[PDB]
Symmetry: C2
Subunit: 34 residues, 2 copies
């Protein structure tokens, strides 16, 4: 098993920022990070 | 009723970025936006 987190938003104008960021940040950790 | 969105992440280093952003972006729309 393991643990994680989850965020919810009711605005599409803001989501576009997180979603797109999710991909960018996803690479930040998946690659190096230390 | 209505509609919204939800994002999930399994990394704390990245979440800190979205979470903190969630508050910042939340104000972007909640205030003006057009």
């Amino acid at each position: 098993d393991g643990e994680y987190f989850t965020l919810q938003i009711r605005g599409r104008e803001r989501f576009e920022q997180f979603r797109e960021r999710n991909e960018a940040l996803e690479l930040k950790d998946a690659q190096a990070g230390k």
